[PDB]
Design brief:
- The chain is of the alpha/beta class.
- The chain folds into 3 domains: about 160 residues, inorganic pyrophosphatase (n-terminal core); about 170 residues, no CATH class; about 120 residues, Diaminopimelate Epimerase, Chain A, domain 1, CATH 3.10.310.40.
- It is built from 20 helices and 17 strands.
- A 6-stranded parallel β-sheet has the order 1-7-5-4-2-3, sandwiched between helices. It has a 6-stranded mixed β-sheet with strand order 12-13-14-15-17-16, sandwiched between helices.
- Strand 12 and strand 13 form a beta hairpin.
- The protein binds chloride ion (CL) (3 copies).
- The PDB classes it as cell cycle.
């Protein structure tokens, strides 16, 4: 059933009543920054009311189902929340015995599964006041729904708007919402906090509010990086400027010179680059944005002051947290990285964000450098407008990306970079030589832009593995990892193509 604002009071009274009996709340969190925001906002309310709760970071529905089965009937869990997952699948079919517990779902995927909607024992939470998935697009941020609960119940703390801003910035960064939807969300925060949108030239040193909004130039981590490298690594802008082509760095340097900015200025920290150079950059970029049609580069940013530092926007924070929760070492996993992301989100100081900024910067420098090479040199093809396939067997690149957690990051980058280059979004299958094991690591990745065909991509990718009798080493909600013998690359490509023809 659909739960809206008129039912939030009854819902929370139930949590309170069941919480007196020593029972607990279990929140299953899928791996998005928005999902962490939702958990955080709910957890703030729960803490204030003494409601025991726990987090279950889930990476796929198999894990969700296994923990649920191990939990129900074996502990004091009386209520479960599924955050940014489960809304668009047949939950009753997945989990079965569900009707003894209180099951709530806060998920941005739409449409909801019809059997979820008609089941009186499944609470699909929306903010209104009036494994096949049915998902076809993304709606309201899950953090925004948690904020809506707090507002309806008179439990809002104004810090929740910072978290909610990070959540909707995550949706926009992740390509789940468009710029108009993002701006409308910010306007909601402006209205409820009675803020004014400050000008892009405002450095915020005189603002009297602990949070604020100003027009901004949305180059990735610009204030925490350099003009030169922030511009080169902002994917939509780099694609439209054509600076990732052959000799793209020579063309880039020509662009920087066209702005009248020396490299000694463009390549130092943006915070120490002179204001005169910043003014030149802004004016030139305004013109470039109309010529190359990236006017959506200029969007309002939501800021929170940390001590004397007002340089961290909700976009900066979403980039930093998104990087922290990306697995990038062999011992990193979502169960642990969820808590690292929660800890950073919860920071009341600026210094913790430096680690996230650094991880994001380093990853993007590595991915863009490798990715440019592969799109120029690699064996990358579009197979029947079903998927792009690329295989890498060069000694140096292969050794660097043969591990699944690295290959997954490269596949995600290439999925976006190739789609922007050819103005055609497809899921991406990447094969990387593991020369020591005599195998290719195979990663399949589907970006949020391709969510409407994720059912088919996952089904056929997994059916190919089944036909080849190779193992799915890992799966997430939007990606898969398998591995083949090196000598079978052609055999595997033929099987994949056949499957994706069925
Ligand atoms: Cl974007
Ligand atoms: Cl807009
Ligand atoms: Cl990386």
């Amino acid at each position: 059933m659909i739960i809206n604002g008129t039912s939030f009071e009854e819902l929370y009274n139930g949590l309170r009543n069941r919480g007196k009996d020593k029972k607990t709340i279990q929140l299953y969190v899928s791996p998005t920054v928005d999902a962490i925001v939702c958990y955080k906002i709910l957890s703030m309310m729960f803490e204030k009311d003494g409601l025991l709760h726990s987090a279950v970071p889930v990476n796929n529905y198999e894990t969700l189902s296994r923990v649920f089965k191990e939990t129900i009937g074996h502990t004091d869990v009386h209520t479960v929340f599924f955050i940014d997952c489960a809304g668009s699948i047949d939950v009753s079919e997945l989990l079965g015995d569900i009707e003894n517990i209180f099951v709530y779902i806060i998920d941005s995927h739409r449409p909801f599964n019809k059997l979820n909607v008609t089941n009186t024992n499944i609470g699909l939470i929306t903010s209104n006041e009036y494994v096949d998935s049915d998902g076809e697009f993304y709606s309201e941020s899950v953090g925004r729904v948690a904020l809506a609960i707090a507002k309806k119940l008179n439990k809002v703390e104004n810090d929740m708007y910072w978290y909610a801003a990070i959540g909707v910035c995550d949706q926009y960064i992740s390509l789940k919402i468009n710029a108009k939807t993002y701006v409308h969300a910010i306007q909601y925060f402006i209205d409820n906090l009675q803020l004014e949108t400050l000008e892009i030239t405002d450095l915020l040193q005189t603002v009297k509010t602990p949070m604020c909004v100003k027009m901004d130039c949305q180059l990735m981590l610009l204030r925490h990086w350099t003009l030169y490298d922030s511009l080169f690594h902002t994917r939509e802008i780099a694609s439209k400027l054509g600076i990732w082509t052959s000799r793209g760095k020579e063309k880039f340097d020509v662009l920087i010179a066209d702005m009248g900015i020396p490299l000694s200025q463009a390549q130092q920290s943006y915070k120490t680059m002179s204001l005169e150079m910043k003014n030149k950059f802004l004016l030139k970029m305004e013109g470039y944005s109309k010529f190359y049609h990236f006017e959506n580069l200029f969007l309002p940013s939501f800021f929170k002051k940390f001590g004397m530092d007002y340089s961290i926007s909700a976009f900066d924070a979403a980039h930093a947290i998104g990087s922290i929760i990306t697995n990038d070492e062999p011992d990193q996993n979502w169960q642990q990285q969820f808590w690292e992301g929660f800890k950073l989100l919860s920071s009341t100081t600026a210094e913790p964000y430096d680690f996230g900024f650094a991880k994001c910067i380093e990853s993007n420098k590595n991915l863009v450098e490798t990715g440019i090479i592969l799109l120029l040199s690699g064996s990358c093809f579009n197979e029947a407008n079903k998927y792009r396939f690329c295989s890498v067997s060069d000694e140096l690149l292969s050794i660097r990306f043969k591990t699944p957690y690295k290959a997954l990051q490269l596949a995600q980058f290439l999925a976006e970079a190739s789609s922007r280059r050819y103005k055609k979004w497809l899921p991406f299958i990447l094969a990387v030589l593991d020369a020591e094991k005599k195998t290719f690591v195979i990663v399949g990745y589907s970006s949020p832009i391709s969510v409407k065909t994720l059912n088919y991509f996952g089904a056929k990718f997994t059916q190919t593995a089944q036909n080849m009798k190779i193992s799915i080493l890992q799966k997430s909600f939007d990606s898969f990892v398998t591995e083949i013998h090196r000598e079978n690359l052609v055999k595997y490509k033929k099987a994949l193509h056949k499957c994706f023809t069925s």
